[PDB]
Amino acid sequence: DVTQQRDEVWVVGMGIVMSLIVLAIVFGNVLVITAIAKFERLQTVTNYFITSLACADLVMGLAVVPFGAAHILMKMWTFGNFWCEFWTSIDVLCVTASIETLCVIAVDRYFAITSPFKYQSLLTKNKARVIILMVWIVSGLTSFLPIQMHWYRATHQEAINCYAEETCCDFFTNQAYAIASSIVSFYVPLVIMVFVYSRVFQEAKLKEHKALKTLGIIMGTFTLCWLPFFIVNIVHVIQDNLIRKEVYILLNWIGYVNSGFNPLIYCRSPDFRIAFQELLCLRR
């Protein structure tokens, strides 16, 4: 069937799938933040790092994903060019904050697993709070400084028209921004996470497997969600017209979804498990 109505169905069908994602992203992180904020037994260094990730993921399905839903289903932009400039800046700021924090929990956790005596003495709260400031300082620098200041802008006529058009909100970057930002937001944190969980797997070698299944869920769900999108960013930088917007957006949305997983991966502690149910009016 192909009329002028069969389209207004796949739209409502995609439209509710998006509204699940947006809720799952919010619910999971509003629960994780309140858990750490209300329960004392959850005030660990590693948990300060779960928090920074939980605010990064909450802002995804709060300011980015909802507008993402719109722009797509609207099949256009209804917020103007400065709000386009702004929204694009949140998008990058949150993706960098999500991925940096994922790799900061990674180094931290390996340091405590490998050397718990150095960690206990060295990594303070007033050291950890400072790690987090830096995470958001770069996140900001890679997002608001180059997008907002026009340092990201493309030069080809197609983009020049889009940048001028208030109903246009297609992201067009110059060969260098896309590479530089991809290395900062993703590959550096990927490399770090690769060799950090590498030394966890190696120094370790029944109980050995179900715990090693874990760093497999961790490193996996992360790659399975962000490597597709970022390898495509590099391919599209080299060979122009080799990636379809259909594909590029579909790939970004997979990563947008990772933000909903993080609560399920990082908050599996028995104290989280206890905290969550008490808040969900089950315990006590």
Next chain:
Amino acid sequence: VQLQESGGGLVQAGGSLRLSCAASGSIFSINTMGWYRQAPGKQRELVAAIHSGGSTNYANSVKGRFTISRDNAANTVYLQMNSLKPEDTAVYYCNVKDYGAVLYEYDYWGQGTQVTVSSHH
């Protein structure tokens, strides 16, 4: 899985003892087995710990005297307490910290082996 402590009991001051603790069961390859002492109606304080890779953390008071070691075959810890002063009289507990699930540490505790250092003159 349970922690099987032994070596506890009365001993003359300036003496010696060997506290042993067998972690009966499956415990992940990366872990820290340590000793914790409950002073007469006071706070629990770590005596000495040993990581399953090789590194220590003796509580500065027992440093020089008491010496912690471990077997990675059966997973048993030996705090050889020499020159036992009446300040060392406390309930000693066995404890294993368990890394992997790699994000948090599963804490395993023991019932406690009482040590009474007497000054019977």
